[PDB]
Amino acid sequence: DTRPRFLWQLKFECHFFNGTERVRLLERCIYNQEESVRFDSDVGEYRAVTELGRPDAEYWNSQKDLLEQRRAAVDTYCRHNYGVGESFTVQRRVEPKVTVYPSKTQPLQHHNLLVCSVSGFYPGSIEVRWFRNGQEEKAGVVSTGLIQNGDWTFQTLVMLETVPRSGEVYTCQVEHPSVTSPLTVEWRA
Amino acid sequence: EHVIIQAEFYLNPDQSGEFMFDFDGDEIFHVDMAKKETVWRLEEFGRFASCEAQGALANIAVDKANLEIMTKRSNYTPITNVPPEVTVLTNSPVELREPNVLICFIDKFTPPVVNVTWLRNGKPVTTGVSETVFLPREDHLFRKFHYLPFLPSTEDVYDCRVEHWGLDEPLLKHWEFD
């Protein structure tokens, strides 16, 4: 199979800010990898993103009946669907499992990365802080960043550059909407 | 901010269509075009909500028509193959002989067609596995997840083999216990 491929995507985007107080509908049409025409509820009519999409914006804008229904969709489409799935989406809360461990076994007084593993959580919004003997360490923090697992959970590894020495106590502290008080996990060098 | 996206596509000449809802990047559901039914991503969703699948097929029929019109209007400018970035991870810290899941992340590619295979010690693993449909990206490329539950061992090696027109050859992404 050597045929060229041709792709068409349609994306109806309902954007919500501050609850459903502010809603924006953004209907986008994409040919191959390039958006060509869109309806933006803030604008009130179709606009050609590229010249290729101009005939469509013109053809559709001429039909004021369709535009009215698009202008109303912010209510009949977005706000309605928000309310449909709110309980299992906006309000989904899954508490993360938090573990701390050295990246690998290193010799005494050798450098190492202390890993704070934060997994299985939802939503994605999270804060992870490192403490050495009760004092926050902001330097030498490297992370994998926020990782979306595709199954409505996230994970992330936040690592602290350090030279673990006997007696030291390292704490990883996690703030997340699923809990009202921070999760803490200690690791003793 | 939260974002709900109804994302649809049609691809020629494959005649592949897709209809899905996305919430902050996670699939709420898609409609099985062949069986004409609504497939919720997590079982619980279906208990709290519903959606008539028949509407999806009508939409996709419109998308197919628009595609052919657009294809001609662009003078048959074909899509540029963009090969996927592939990553294999566990969904939790790996404990020897402790149930876990391998995730093959297939990301930043187009068109939305790929062949994916899990390999254990070089042998295809075709049971226990699962996958998602194609998920939308803001740059209008696609994401996809494949899953393989397993039991960590010092004896097993794993690969996710991915094939895509953007690639000169099959891509193997390796995972094994230290």
Binding site: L10, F12, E27, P55, D56, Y59, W60, L66, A73, T76, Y77, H80, N81, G83, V84, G85 | Q6, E8, F21, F48, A49, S50, C51, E52, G55, A56, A58, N59, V62, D63, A65, N66, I69, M70
Partner: peptide, 14 residues
């Protein structure tokens, strides 16, 4: 439909 997702409908091109 209160508990039913509504689908937006794509416009046809000329």
């Amino acid at each position: 439909p209160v508990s039913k997702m509504r689908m937006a409908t794509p416009l046809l091109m000329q």
